[PDB]
Amino acid sequence: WSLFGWGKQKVEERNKVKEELKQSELARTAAAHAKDQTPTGISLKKDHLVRVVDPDPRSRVRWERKMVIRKLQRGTDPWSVEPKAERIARTERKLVYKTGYLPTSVKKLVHLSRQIRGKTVSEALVQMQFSKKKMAKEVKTELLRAEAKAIVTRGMGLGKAAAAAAQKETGAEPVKIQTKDGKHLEIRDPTRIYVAETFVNKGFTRGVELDYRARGRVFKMNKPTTTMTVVLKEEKTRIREHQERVAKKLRQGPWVHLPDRPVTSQRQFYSW
Amino acid sequence: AAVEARNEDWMLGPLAPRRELDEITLSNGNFFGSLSPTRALLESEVSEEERKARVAWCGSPKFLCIAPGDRVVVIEGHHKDLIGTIEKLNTRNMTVEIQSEKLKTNTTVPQFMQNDADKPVTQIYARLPISSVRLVHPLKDPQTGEYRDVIIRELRPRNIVHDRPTRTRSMRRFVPGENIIIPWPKQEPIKREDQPAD
Amino acid sequence: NDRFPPLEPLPPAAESLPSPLPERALTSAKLAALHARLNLSPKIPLQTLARTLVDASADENPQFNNANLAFVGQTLINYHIAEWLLCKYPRLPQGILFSAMKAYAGPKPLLQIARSWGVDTAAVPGGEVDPGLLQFDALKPGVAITNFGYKRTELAYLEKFKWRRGMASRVVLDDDFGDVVRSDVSYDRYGNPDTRAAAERAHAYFVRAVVGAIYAHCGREAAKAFVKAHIMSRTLDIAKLFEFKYPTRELAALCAREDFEPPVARLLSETGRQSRTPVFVVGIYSGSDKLGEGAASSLDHARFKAAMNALKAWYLYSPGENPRVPSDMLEEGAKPWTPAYIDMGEVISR
Amino acid sequence: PSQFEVTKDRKAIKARQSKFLSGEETWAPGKVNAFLNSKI
Amino acid sequence: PRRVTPVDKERMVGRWKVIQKELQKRELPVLGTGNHGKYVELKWLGSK
Amino acid sequence: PKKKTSHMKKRHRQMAGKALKDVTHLNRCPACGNLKRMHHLCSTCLGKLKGFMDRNG
RNA sequence: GAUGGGGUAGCAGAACGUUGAGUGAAUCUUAGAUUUUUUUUUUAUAACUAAAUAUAGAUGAUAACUCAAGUGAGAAUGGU
RNA sequence: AUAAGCAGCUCAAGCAAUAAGAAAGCGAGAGCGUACCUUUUGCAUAAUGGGUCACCAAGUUAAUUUUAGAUGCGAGCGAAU
RNA sequence: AUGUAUUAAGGAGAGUAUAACUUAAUUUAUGUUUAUGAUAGAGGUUAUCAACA
Ligand SMILES: [K+]
Ligand SMILES: [Mg+2]
Ligand SMILES: [Mg+2]
Ligand SMILES: [Mg+2]
Ligand SMILES: [Mg+2]
Ligand SMILES: [Mg+2]
Ligand SMILES: [Mg+2]
Ligand SMILES: [Mg+2]
Ligand SMILES: [Mg+2]
Ligand SMILES: [Mg+2]
Ligand SMILES: [Mg+2]
Ligand SMILES: [Mg+2]
Ligand SMILES: [Mg+2]
Ligand SMILES: [Zn+2]
């Protein structure tokens, strides 16, 4: 039902689509049947999603055969170890969010992405509310959307109440880490969301202005639009990355006074 | 999107996202797991060499040998080997509607024809092209005389006769190779009435 | 199917057997190459080399498995190295001796000898696999060989409550490396530190088995040459197996035991005192004789390092690089045996 | 982006956000992202 | 006599007999493409 | 310009000492508790009190 | 126990690669043909091994020999 | 963040794989090295040309007249019946 | 590009069922063959479900 075909048809045709939608709502209507639909009306039945969630079952099936054979070639090997990338994906939550097309440039918005980098979402929103830049109001709206996606879609930031207990009910000693830049933090809630990564890209050309100079000269001025990507992670990623840097510093060994430096010239005689 | 959604369910495991609670895709404006009305009703016009291909197995676009009211069997897609009765017959795109509860699919309703309390997504009956369905008709076993259902793979018109004064015609459909004249399904004529302005 | 006929003709009851049949080893190109790679004599048939590659975890039957060959082989390897190590370094401390026996005939080096022979392991044991692959089951926890060591009555306490074990009972109670004795299926998993041990165990047992087959078919002298060529040819710096606690005290007990005059640390040379990286060379002198010398950055460390070098020189005393072995007598007529040096033992001090 | 009228899909993700944070509902992994035969 | 395929290599190692069980237990297709058919979403829209 | 400025010498000019400074002079508002700048009047309470004095008086 | 070894203008020999064509109604491909990548090896303007991603049964790719050229670009204040 | 590199080459410390095995890459430090093309007796030349990348972009065809090699026939050849 | 066949005045403005073309902008009739074609139904706007002459 297009927006320019809805008025090009007679009432009988239009009034025949409403009885279709009407009769579709009588079949959708306590708890076991009411949990198969989202508040937006998306029916969570397999037959209703198989055509969109599983459009190509002939290719998915073969791909799932490739991963099961690759998973048994590792369970047979006695020396296999879970890759670092496979072990983090199933332990640490992450959300990549790409903002909408902002009416600004990359050399302007790049400085607004380096300001919120590394900060927590709460710390980053307080800096967008009190910035003088016109694009800081757009970064505050796009950072609230990403946080909503993280909490709902990915489940992040949902452990506070549980973490507040150990700190106070048991007087536990929170974790003290140090970021890659060197800033010291004290994490009491490991589920707190923060801005791990962020980069700005350039989009399509908003428009074109003409610059009428002297001597009948004209120049084209491209109006830029740009986007920003935020990678939101929980504080468990920073507590893991700090323990790795600390372990790599205690693994290089201590400093010895007289080191055994190599002599890198080989000669077919003795010089001493 | 399905190539990337399956790699995440494999990797994330217990951290698999809840994509059904996500926002729409601004490229097309659809929700998760829902089609678009243009793609769920198959109302997009097709070329003339396509209509002849979709109807190749049942006559031709102007001598179609399938009518509404006759049971068909699906032979393509996820809902293969399904059997339902034809309700509508769109002769423009050569698409057919089967009012079976298994062919339903989520669709995103455009907000210009929807109230503000109405749910954005609804389940409507999806249509199929004519090529994706074959005719099912019960025939008699010549050896034992028992009636059983069979799938008709091809139909062709027979005994075509036109009426020039009325611009009408009446033909018969038969199964090539076996010459089994299949009767037409019970079609109710449109109700013609006398209006006050006539 | 018809398009892909099987590459190897096998009966239908072949994928269920624990290990390939004996007659299967007579048609595999991996065994024939493995037999010719180690220069094994033609006395050892291919049906015997195949049995060496079947671990007891893939086959529970005493025959068709490495259990018996790997035993007879471990006894020869251990005996030949024990006698060679005592003749070469007669004064090695007992703990270091265990570390050096384990450094040659242990699961770690024997795993590299099998990987240097081009021995590829089988994914999962079965009758279909070609006999040229080392086949074992790494998910079976209880697989182990029979050893001469006995189980300690206080084993549980030693692990749980950190009781003291000792280094004089290890010779009798423990195994030959000093360690204590007795210390469907889903393949959707990853490696384990326990499976890695089974992988090491399977390789070691195979290398031990090859020596057991050489002994059975070719005799004693053939086994000794194989051990002498493939195992004893490996190089180890025994000076790097030493860890000292209070060496200066131990060195004093040595001189006191041997009746040598008390040791005195003397500063042979030095430079850069009152600097970031000074060098002090101190020599420990028993009377006029110089026992050992060490150079370090700290004056105390230089005295400790000098005492270690003097102790290493005492323990690492070697009559010769290629000494005669008591096993050289039981073979064909050789020169009369000359008594070898027997050291009292390592000094026990505070 | 700050001026786009919030649609019906953006109003349902804000009601869920307040229901998860408050503690009414407990977040659980998605079950309809893809129809894999492994189910793990 | 014929080309050695990844299937032949796995049989030699012994891993294949385990793969047939896992693929069969998961209802996946051993040495085939199954009863599933070709992608028809674009073909149904009249794609050429 | 005689030559084209490289990626290095242009990145020095753009970001070396030109990082946006984080505003740290923020205090809460006594009447409502909302975050405001230091020594400044709350923008949400100003409008509300400014409108409260226009209705009744 | 053969002789010879820089090179502009210039002359000569021998090859590779690109596009299309014949043999070709041929060969190969879900037991993965093809994937602008990465990687490996081989006296190597080239091909090859493996890996990763996607999924094709031919309007797909292709050895070898041969045929014809709109056949090879850091350089024209060249052009888009 | 003590340094005067046509950013390559020769020498090379060190870092780099949670683990059996496996080091590509980056490289402190030492030395050598004044872009390319065109045009000229001769150009790092402060002589000409180029902001980068992709694509377009130049000894070809016809007739005619020769030569070499190969090959058919042979005091005939070619063409054509 | 060449060849074969046929033909021997071309354009624009505005309007109109947006495959349909001239304020009649989808005229009205004939003959034949219609699945063994040609190359015993439904359907006049829910239209033109028939091509050739
Ligand atoms: K050219
Ligand atoms: Mg002017
Ligand atoms: Mg009729
Ligand atoms: Mg020369
Ligand atoms: Mg030359
Ligand atoms: Mg590729
Ligand atoms: Mg140019
Ligand atoms: Mg410096
Ligand atoms: Mg001049
Ligand atoms: Mg200059
Ligand atoms: Mg110049
Ligand atoms: Mg210039
Ligand atoms: Mg060109
Ligand atoms: Zn206030």
**DSSP states of A31-71 as a string?**
-TTTTSB-TT--B--HHHHHHHHSS-HHHHHHHHHHHHHHH
**Rounded to 5 degrees, what are φ and ψ at C226?**
-65, -45
Give me the residues paired with residue F35 across strands. Answer: F28
- Resolution of this model in Å is 3.0
DSSP letters, C43-76, are TS-HHHHHHHTB-TTT--SSTTSSHHHHHHHHHH
Give me the residues paired with residue B134 across strands. Answer: B73
Contacts of C229 (CB under 8 A, 6+ apart): none
H or E, element range at A160: helix A160-168
Q: Exposure string (b/e) for C262-284, b if CB count within 10 Å is 16 or more?
A: ebebeebeeeeeeeeebbbbbbb
Distance E3 CA to G48 C1' (A): 18
Of A182, A191, A116, A134, residue with least CA distance to A161: A191
Cβ neighbour number for residue E1 with a 10 Å cutoff: 4
Q: Any idea what the Cα angle at residue C103 is, between residues C97 and C105, rounded to 5°?
A: 100
Taking an 8 Å cut-off on Cβ atoms, the answer to whether B20 and D16 are in contact is no
Give B114→chain A minimum CA distance, Å: 10
Of A77, D18, C60, A102, residue with least CA distance to E15: A77
d(CA A135, CA A108): 9
Cβ neighbour number for residue C294 with a 10 Å cutoff: 22
DSSP letters, chain B, are -HHHHHHHHHHHGGG---GGGSPPBTTTTB-TT-B-HHHHTT-S---HHHHHHHTTTBS-TTS----TTSEEEE-SSSSTT-EEEEEEEETTTTEEEE--TTSEEEEEPPGGGS-SSS-SEEEEEPEEEGGGEEEEEEEE-TTT--EEEEEE--BEEEEEEEETTTTEEEEEEEETTTTEEEPPP--PPP-----TT-
Give me the residues paired with residue A175 across strands. Answer: A187
If DSSP codes are grouped into helix, strand and coil, which group holds residue A91? Answer: coil
**Residues of A near B (CB-CB distance < 8 A)?**
1-3, 6, 20-21, 24-25, 27-28, 38-44, 47-57, 60, 63-64, 67, 86, 89-91, 93, 100, 145, 149, 152-155
d(CA E16, CA B111): 55
Alpha helices in C106-153 (DSSP H): 107-115
B15 to chain D: closest CA residue: D29
Contacts of C235 (CB under 8 A, 6+ apart): none
d(CA C262, CA C256): 7
Beta strands in C256-324 (DSSP E): 263-271, 279-286, 289-296
CB C135 within 8 A of CB C31: no
CB A37 within 8 A of CB B123: no
Give me the residues paired with residue B169 across strands. Answer: B162
CB A163 within 8 A of CB A190: yes
E34 in contact with chain B, both atoms CB, cutoff 8 A = no
Contact, C153 CB vs strand G, < 7 Å: no
Taking an 8 Å cut-off on Cβ atoms, the answer to whether D33 and B19 are in contact is yes
Contacts of B22 (CB under 8 A, 6+ apart): A149, A152, A153, B32, D13
CA distance to A202, A255, C200, C247, C276, per residue, from C279 (Å) = 62, 16, 45, 20, 10
Instruction: Report CA(B170)–ligand 3 centroid distance (Å).
Output: 5
Cβ neighbour number for residue C310 with a 10 Å cutoff: 25
CA distance to A214, C25, C215, per residue, from C48 (Å) = 99, 9, 12
B123 to chain A: closest CA residue: A24
CB A172 within 8 A of CB A166: yes
d(CA C102, CA E22): 41
d(CA A257, CA A148): 55
Place of tokens 């060994």: A253
CB B128 within 8 A of CB B56: no
Give me the residues paired with residue B125 across strands. Answer: B104
Closest nt by CA–C1' to C199? H20
d(CA D34, CA A53): 6
Place of tokens 């290095």: F8
Q: Which residues make up the interface with nucleic strand H when CB must lie under 7 A?
A: A 79, 81-82, 84, 87, 248, 251-252, 261-262, 264; C 111, 196; F 4, 6, 8
Q: How was this structure determined?
A: cryo-EM
Distance B38 CA to H14 C1' (A): 64
Distance B159 CA to I52 C1' (A): 19
Q: Which of C195, C276, C296 sits opposite A78 (nearest CB)?
A: C195
CB C223 within 8 A of CB C79: no
**Rounded to 5 degrees, what are φ and ψ at D13?**
-80, -15
CA distance to A190, B22, B106, B115, C44, per residue, from B26 (Å) = 33, 12, 18, 21, 75
Cβ neighbour number for residue B47 with a 10 Å cutoff: 10
d(CA F52, CA B165): 85
Place of tokens 């090695």: C92
**Rounded to 5 degrees, what are φ and ψ at A201?**
-115, 165
Distance F4 CA to H35 C1' (A): 16
**What 8-state DSSP symbol labels residue C268?**
E
Query: Dihedral of CA C113/C116/C119/C120: which sign?
Result: positive
Of D18, B23, B14, residue with least CA distance to A151: D18
In chain A, residues with a C-beta closer than 8 Å to the C-beta of E17 are none
If DSSP codes are grouped into helix, strand and coil, which group holds residue A199? Answer: strand
